[PDB]
């Protein structure tokens, strides 16, 4: 029992999580 | 807008105020009659509501609310019949018949009572001038 | 709230302003209680009562006998009293198919009498109830059209005459009423 | 046949209008295209990666390949006759579960075969990323299939990836010291100022896609567009309610998109399994029999025959390979269409029963004559369409188009399908 | 295409307040992308989905539709429906609450009454105008749901309340003649008592009209006559069934002005009445009706916004008295018979103007209304009676109430 | 030989579309293809700098 907006929220949240992992990797590499 | 809680109010008043024992049966018959009228109304109104829902002009949650009311009415009727069986021994085979009659009968009585008021809305609407004896004075 | 009378065994609402549904329900419960008090058998039967029917018929016959005496004023009062009795003192758990036709057979006579006497609004309203409770015949539509014409309502007169002629097209009086309505309305406009 | 407790999207209680349908399709398309570009954190096949809507080095590395392969699996199963709303529900939940287990297997296969290699936490992170990235695509396709979207997402996503690749091959703004044919030609016509030298150099352009491939792909596109217009029409009349005269058309491509995609999926799976088997073990008789790999391309093996042709040179080199390849690619679609038409529910028997329910009968043919003509027309039409699709694909491959050979064909079929659906629905 | 003779005289009588109302109403890129794809897309998509999900198909809320249905379910037939009851049903709508979250339904009923009675509210004019301009869509919602429940009396009540709101006059016996621009009630109501509709009015001469209606201003009397000789009275010419796979009624109405005398039916050349039989014609017959010009702007000097006329036609049965299909709201019809070119055709002259030089039987245009019956042909063999109504929805003109019967013979 | 035997009969049986309908066909297919190609091209062209910056 899932609504469409739930699927869209999951997809955008996952894209956000991947880009966030990339950016935290970059800032950790540049900082130290 | 219901005749349910009125019987419970009469019962809580009976618990203290020493009301006569037939008034309980009276309120019970009235509640049964209202439940029967409602059941008939819903059984007859199901198809048109369903058609309006399929055509898409009533929304979505109203149909679920309707389907809930259909069974809530049945459970209320069953509870009332059980209370009736409790009130008098071997008194359920006669109860449904007495109820199915009083429903229609009091519906007719109310419809016939309504004309004493309905007689004046026509006068106000058509601006008639009727003197005594109901005649027309133009 | 609501206070229970002691001696009269009637439930009475003691609040100042009560809604309409509660008033109708309290009236119904008063009637049911006062009737159960009179009915002494513990297990009542939907079988109708006999003394009430005999007295109703007696009053109705005493009212109808004024037709032979050419008394057209008190016969209406007697028939009204008989209908009021058959409406009030008949316990609601008595059968439906025996309480409906008696009411109709008395109400039709009252309608004929009132329409002959001269009162028109009461006759039209009685006809509307009689036709709304499930009785559709050319013995009702002709008089309803007569009333709607006599108290000056033309469009609904035409609508009712047409509905009547669309159920008994071979009738002989509905066409006269339709022609009269058409003429009077063509005057009403032009 | 077992219990099923899995996540799914709820159906619409009432039919969705056209505008909300279009908006849902557009937004789902945007989400898929965005998901296509963003690359993984733990950071070859040319035609198949394009025909299965997957590009390497991105979250979409898996693509719709597991779903299409599960479809192929159930098609093969229905072929051997190993197989009521309950039956359809069981079939669909079985499709979903084999899809998810195939995703789980394919992720591990790719990570084992990937150039990333074994040297573990980052590896499990990568597996989880690919798992979620493909699960979202499966859920999105099921959403568009439930009724919110026009058609199944499996076809639309691949058509969109192929169309975007086609546009990028022509209008590429990257400069080499230009990657797009039109921009490079427009620049060189201006700077070089030697038209006779400029044309003879830009037309061939062995290094990068040229204008010649553009003209060839436009030609094959316009040509294949007209073929779809062909149809067979049979008149019908009503018997229960008289006065209802209609027309029932039968297209030459009864199942247009399905056969070529199924064939491409099968080719992808066999090529990948042969590659990993040739890599894992150095020398074996059966491994060398299934295929040998060298300079990368497969050669002298089973995969050597089934892999597509590059240009007319490889065709004129060895005729036996071309013969076996053409025969295989034709017969594969020919048998796949006749097998898919049954499970799809559009069998001549099923449409005959539908005619019985509607009561539509031929003006001049008797009762059983309608069913005997359906059995005479529908299967032959499906077979001819399946063969024609493969023939057009191999012809476009021989023409040397800029994109994948079957890619333009898939784009045409999908776009025409959606256009005809929108026209039939109206608005 | 259709000449509109009120676009000039409509804005000259409307008050000032209504005029003013109608006039009134490196890491920067990654942060920008994170914003545009985390806070803009999901939020806007959720808002649009919620908005387009709540609203009903007809164009009304969901609470409003639930209220109308829960009011039509428990409706005792003992109550006669007047305009006040429908206004009381409308004062419970939900789309009136979002406009003014402070006002209570009783205030809404009081405001609507202050509008219909042509009375002043004083301070909440820009609220009364909003609710009245919104009331139209709600009334169409109520009409459609009432026709859905197979109930006729509430449908006629709804159409009559819509007429009353549009024209700003309470429903009375002699109201067709109080919908005019400028009449003083306290004079006309008391002096005369036999002038009840436009025809009986035009039976009198020109100066007698001014003397009766009591305005006594030539430059103002010509205005009220140019309003009282331009509202459409209908009249039928030929009306019966047609039997394709789905039967559909074909009416032949003659839109006339309230001044022209009666023309006999036999003078019709019978050519304009018949239909051409062609392949494109037999495919979709309603293409001929969908062609005619549109209807002009009504004369509503007290409706806030502007509207085009209409004609709400609804069909009902004659064996019990129930509505059997949703009301078809036709829109296009030819008002060509009204123009000022054929002014010689007057009623007061009484000279048998039919045999006149400018009388051209092929000059009058005769519109056409087509109603799809929507219900299958009954399986029995015999007679089945119907009754079609064509109620107008901006004026108090004359309408159609005819009974047409289908004789299924097979 | 039987396969081509049925195929030639079926292709002789099927009708040929007109030239005018083909104009509308190519018009609709072209506008749809242009739309999808422009969407894909824009989404590819916007995500290049963000992918260079992030990685």
UniProtKB/Swiss-Prot annotation, chain A:
Where in the cell does this protein reside? Endoplasmic reticulum membrane
- Lineage of producing organism: Eukaryota, Fungi, Dikarya, Ascomycota, Saccharomycotina
Identify the stretch annotated as signal peptide in this record: none
What family name appears in the similarity comment?
A: Belongs to the SEC61-beta family.
Q: What is this protein called?
A: Protein transport protein SBH1
Complex formation: Component of the heterotrimeric Sec61 complex, which is composed of SSH1, SBH1 and SSS1. Presumably three to four Sec61 heterotrimers assemble into an oligomeric ring with a central aqueous pore. In cotranslational ER import, the pore diameter varies from 9-15 A in a ribosome-free resting state to 40-60 A in a functional state when associated with the ribosome. The Sec61 complex is part of a channel-forming translocon complex whose composition seem to change dependent upon different functional states.
**Disulfides per UniProt:** none
Q: Where are the transmembrane segments?
A: 4-24
Q: Which residues of the full protein are shown?
A: 51 to 82 of 82
Q: Which organism is it from?
A: Saccharomyces cerevisiae (strain ATCC 204508 / S288c) (Baker's yeast)
From Swiss-Prot, chain C:
Extract one GO BP annotation from the record. post-translational protein targeting to membrane, translocation
Database matches in Gene3D superfamilies: Tetratricopeptide repeat domain
Which keywords, in A-to-Z order, does the entry hold?
Cytoplasm, Protein transport, Transport
Subcellular location(s) of the protein: Cytoplasm
One MF term in the entry's GO annotations? protein transmembrane transporter activity
Q: What's the superkingdom here?
A: Eukaryota
Which GO cellular component terms are attached? endoplasmic reticulum; rough endoplasmic reticulum membrane; Sec62/Sec63 complex; translocon complex
* Subunit field text: Component of the heterotetrameric Sec62/63complex composed of SEC62, SEC63, SEC71 and SEC72. The Sec62/63 complex associates with the Sec61 complex to form the Sec complex. May interact with protein YLR301W. Part of a complex consisting of KAR2, SEC63, SEC66 and SEC72.
Other observations noted? Present with 5290 molecules/cell in log phase SD medium.
**What is the purpose of this protein?**
Acts as a non-essential component of the Sec62/63 complex which is involved in SRP-independent post-translational translocation across the endoplasmic reticulum (ER) and functions together with the Sec61 complex and KAR2 in a channel-forming translocon complex. A cycle of assembly and disassembly of Sec62/63 complex from SEC61 may govern the activity of the translocon.
* Protein name, entry field: Translocation protein SEC72
Swiss-Prot record, chain E:
| Tree of life domain | Eukaryota
Chain ranges passing through the membrane: 27-45
Impact after mutating residue 301 to A:
Temperature-sensitive
Start and end residues of the sequence repeats are 259-269, 291-301
Q: Which residues form a coiled coil?
A: none
**Where Phosphoserine occurs along the chain?**
310
Q: Name one GO cellular component term.
A: nuclear inner membrane
Region (2 X 11 AA repeats) residue spans: 259-301
Recorded GO MF terms: protein transmembrane transporter activity
> Which residues does the entry place in the Cytoplasmic compartment?
46-410
Location in the cell reads: Endoplasmic reticulum membrane; Nucleus membrane; Nucleus inner membrane
- SEC63 domain residues are 34-330
Its predominant location is endoplasmic reticulum
Q: Name one GO biological process term.
A: post-translational protein targeting to endoplasmic reticulum membrane
Topology versus the membrane: Multi-pass membrane protein
Q: Relate the protein's function as given in its record.
A: Acts as a component of the Sec62/63 complex which is involved in SRP-independent post-translational translocation across the endoplasmic reticulum (ER) and functions together with the Sec61 complex and KAR2 in a channel-forming translocon complex. A cycle of assembly and disassembly of Sec62/63 complex from SEC61 may govern the activity of the translocon. SEC63 may affect SEC1-polypeptide interactions by increasing the affinity of targeting pathways for SEC61 and/or by modifying SEC61 to allow more efficient polypeptide interaction.
* Designated name of the protein: Protein translocation protein SEC63
Q: Which residues of the full protein are shown?
A: 54 to 612 of 663
Curated annotation (Swiss-Prot), chain F:
Q: Which domain of life is it from?
A: Eukaryota
Which species is listed as the source?
Saccharomyces cerevisiae (strain ATCC 204508 / S288c) (Baker's yeast)
**Endoplasmic reticulum among the record's keywords?**
yes
- Quote the subcellular location field of this record: Endoplasmic reticulum membrane
The record describes the protein's role as: Part of the Sec61 complex, which is the major component of channel-forming translocon complex that mediates protein translocation across the endoplasmic reticulum (ER). The functional states of the translocon complex include co- and post-translational ER import, cotranslational membrane protein integration and retrograde transport of misfolded proteins out of the ER. In the cotranslational pathway, ribosomes synthesizing presecretory proteins are targeted to the translocon by the cytosolic signal recognition particle (SRP) and its ER-localized receptor.
Give one GO term, molecular function aspect.
Answer: protein transmembrane transporter activity
Q: How does it sit in the membrane?
A: Single-pass membrane protein
An annotated GO BP: SRP-dependent cotranslational protein targeting to membrane, translocation
Q: Which GO terms describe its cellular component?
A: endoplasmic reticulum; endoplasmic reticulum membrane; nuclear inner membrane; rough endoplasmic reticulum membrane; Sec61 translocon complex; Ssh1 translocon complex; translocon complex
Give the main localization category. Answer: endoplasmic reticulum
Q: Which family does it belong to?
A: Belongs to the SecE/SEC61-gamma family.
Q: Which parts of the sequence lie on the Extracellular side of the lipid bilayer?
A: 51-55
Q: Which gene is transcribed and translated to give this protein?
A: SSS1
The membrane-spanning stretches of this chain are 22-50
- Which UniProt keywords are present, listed alphabetically? Endoplasmic reticulum, Membrane, Protein transport, Translocation, Transmembrane, Transmembrane helix, Transport
Q: What is this protein called?
A: Protein transport protein SSS1
């Amino acid at each position: 029992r899932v609504d469409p907006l739930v699927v869209l929220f999951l997809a955008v949240g996952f894209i956000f999580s991947v880009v966030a992992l990339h950016v935290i990797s970059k800032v950790a590499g540049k900082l130290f | 807008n219901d005749a349910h809680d009125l019987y419970f109010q009469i019962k809580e008043m009976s618990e203290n105020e020493k009301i006569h024992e037939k008034v309980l049966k009276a309120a019970l018959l009235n509640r049964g009659a209202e439940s029967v009228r409602r059941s008939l109304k819903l059984k007859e109104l199901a198809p048109q509501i369903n058609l309006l829902y399929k055509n898409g002009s009533i929304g979505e949650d109203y149909w679920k609310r309707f389907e809930t009311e259909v069974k809530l009415i049945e459970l209320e009727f069953k509870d009332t019949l059980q209370e009736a069986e409790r009130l008098q021994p071997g008194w359920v085979q006669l109860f449904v018949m007495v109820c199915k009659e009083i429903c229609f009968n009091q519906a007719l009585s109310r419809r016939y009572q309504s004309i004493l008021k309905r007689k004046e809305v026509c006068i106000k609407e058509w601006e008639l001038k009727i003197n005594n004896d109901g005649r027309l004075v133009n | 709230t609501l206070e229970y009378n002691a001696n009269s065994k009637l439930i009475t609402a003691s609040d100042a302003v009560v809604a309409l549904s509660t008033e109708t329900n309290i009236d119904q419960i008063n009637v049911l209680t006062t009737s159960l008090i009179g009915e002494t058998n513990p297990n009542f039967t939907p079988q109708p009562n006999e003394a009430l029917s005999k007295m109703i018929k007696g009053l109705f016959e005493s009212g109808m006998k004024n037709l032979q005496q050419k008394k057209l004023n008190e016969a209406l009062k007697n028939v009204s009293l008989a209908i009021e009795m058959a409406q009030r003192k008949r316990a609601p758990w008595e059968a439906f198919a025996i309480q409906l036709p008696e009411l109709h057979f008395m109400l039709r006579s009252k309608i004929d009498l009132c329409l002959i006497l001269g009162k028109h609004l009461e006759a039209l309203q009685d006809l509307d109830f009689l036709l709304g409770t499930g009785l559709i015949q050319p013995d009702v539509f002709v008089r309803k059209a007569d009333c709607l014409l006599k108290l000056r309502q033309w469009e609904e007169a035409r609508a009712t005459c047409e509905r009547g002629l669309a159920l008994a097209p071979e009738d002989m009086k509905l066409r006269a009423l339709l022609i009269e309505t058409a003429r009077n309305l063509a005057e009403y406009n032009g | 046949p077992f219990e099923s407790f899995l996540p799914e999207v709820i159906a619409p209680e009432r039919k969705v209008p056209y505008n909300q349908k279009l908006i849902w399709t557009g937004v789902s398309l945007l989400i898929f295209l965005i998901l296509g570009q963003i690359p993984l954190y733990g950071i070859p096949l040319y035609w198949l990666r394009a025909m299965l809507a997957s590009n390497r080095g991105t979250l979409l590395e898996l693509g719709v390949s597991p779903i299409i392969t599960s479809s192929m699996i159930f098609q093969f199963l229905q072929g051997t006759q190993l197989l009521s709303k309950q039956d359809r529900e069981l079939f669909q939940i079985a499709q979903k579960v084999c899809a998810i287990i195939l995703i789980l297997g394919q992720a591990l296969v790719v990570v084992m075969t990937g150039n990333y290699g074994a040297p573990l936490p980052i590896c499990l992170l990568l597996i989880f990323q690919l798992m979620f990235a493909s699960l979202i695509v499966m859920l999105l396709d099921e959403l568009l299939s439930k009724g919110y979207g026009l058609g199944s997402g499996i076809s639309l996503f691949t058509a969109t990836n192929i169309a975007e690749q086609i546009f990028w091959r022509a209008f590429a703004p990257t400069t080499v010291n230009f990657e797009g044919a039109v921009i490079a030609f427009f620049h060189l016509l201006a700077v070089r100022k030697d038209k006779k030298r400029a044309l003879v150099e830009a037309f061939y352009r062995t290094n990068l896609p040229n204008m010649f491939q553009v003209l060839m792909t436009v030609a094959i596109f316009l040509f294949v567009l007209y073929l779809q217009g062909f149809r067979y029409e049979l008149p019908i009349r009503s018997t229960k309610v008289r006065g209802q005269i209609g027309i029932y058309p039968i297209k030459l491509f009864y199942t247009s998109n399905t056969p070529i995609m199924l064939q491409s999926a099968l080719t992808s799976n066999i090529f990948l399994i042969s590659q990993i088997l040739f890599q894992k073990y150095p020398t074996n008789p059966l491994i060398r029999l299934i295929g040998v790999w060298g300079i990368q391309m497969a050669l002298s093996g089973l995969a050597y025959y089934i892999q597509p042709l590059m240009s007319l040179s490889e065709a004129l080199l060895d005729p036996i390979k071309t013969i076996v390849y053409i025969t295989f690619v034709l017969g594969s679609c020919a048998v796949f269409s006749k097998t898919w038409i049954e499970i799809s529910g559009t069998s001549p028997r099923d449409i005959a029963k539908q005619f019985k329910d509607q009561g539509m009968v031929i003006n001049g043919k008797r009762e059983t004559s309608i069913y005997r003509e359906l059995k005479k027309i529908i299967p032959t039409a499906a077979a001819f369409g399946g063969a024609t699709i493969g023939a057009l694909s191999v012809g476009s491959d021989l023409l040397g188009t800029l994109g994948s050979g079957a890619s333009i064909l898939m784009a045409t079929t999908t776009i025409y399908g959606y256009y005809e659906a929108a026209a039939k629905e109206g608005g | 295409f259709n000449e509109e003779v009120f676009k000039n005289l409509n804005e000259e009588y409307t008050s000032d307040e209504i005029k003013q109302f109608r006039r009134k109403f490196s890491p920067l890129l990654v942060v920008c992308y994170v914003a545009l794809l985390g806070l803009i897309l999901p939020y806007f998509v959720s808002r649009w989905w919620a908005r387009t999900q709540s609203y009903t198909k007809k164009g009304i809320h969901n609470v409003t539709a639930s209220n109308f249905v829960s009011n039509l379910v428990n409706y005792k037939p003992s109550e006669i429906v007047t305009t006040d009851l429908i206004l009381h049903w409308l004062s419970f709508a939900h789309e009136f609450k979002q406009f003014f979250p402070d006002l209570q339904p009783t205030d809404f009923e009081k405001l609507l009454q202050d509008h219909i009675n042509r009375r002043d509210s004083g301070k909440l004019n820009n609220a009364k105008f909003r609710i009245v301009a919104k009331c139209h869509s709600l009334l169409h919602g109520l009409l459609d749901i009432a026709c859905g429940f197979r109930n006729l009396d509430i449908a006629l009540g709804a159409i009559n309340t819509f007429k009353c709101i549009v024209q700003a006059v309470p429903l009375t016996p002699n109201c067709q003649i109080l919908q005019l621009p400028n009449v003083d009630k306290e004079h006309f109501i008391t002096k005369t008592g036999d002038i009840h509709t436009l025809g009986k009015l035009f039976t009198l001469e020109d100066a007698k009209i001014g003397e009766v209606l009591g305005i006594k201003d030539q430059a103002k009397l010509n205005e009220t006559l140019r309003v009282a000789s331009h509202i459409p009275n209908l009249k039928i010419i030929k009306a019966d069934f047609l039997v394709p796979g789905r039967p559909y009624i074909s009416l032949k109405v003659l839109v006339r002005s309230a001044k022209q005398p009666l023309i006999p039916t036999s003078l019709i050349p019978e050519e304009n009445l018949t239909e051409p039989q062609d392949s494109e014609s037999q495919r979709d017959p309603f293409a001929m009706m969908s062609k005619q010009p549109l209807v002009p702007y009504s004369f509503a000097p007290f409706f806030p916004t502007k509207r085009r006329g209409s004609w709400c036609c609804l069909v009902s049965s004659q064996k019990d008295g129930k509505i059997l299909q949703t009301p078809i709201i036709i829109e296009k019809l030819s008002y060509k018979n009204l123009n000022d070119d054929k002014d010689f055709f007057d009623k007061r002259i009484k000279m048998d103007l039919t045999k006149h030089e400018k009388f051209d039987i092929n000059d009058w245009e005769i519109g056409t209304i087509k109603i799809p019956l929507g219900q299958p042909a009954p399986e029995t063999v015999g007679d089945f009676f119907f009754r079609v109504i064509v109620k107008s929805t901006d004026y108090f003109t004359t309408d159609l109430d005819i009974t047409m019967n289908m004789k299924v013979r097979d | 030989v039987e396969f081509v035997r049925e195929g030639t009969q079926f292709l002789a049986k099927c009708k040929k579309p007109d030239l005018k309908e083909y104009t509308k066909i190519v018009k609709a297919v072209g506008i749809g293809f242009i739309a999808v190609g422009i969407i894909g091209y824009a989404i590819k062209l916007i995500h290049i700098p963000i992918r260079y910056v992030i990685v």
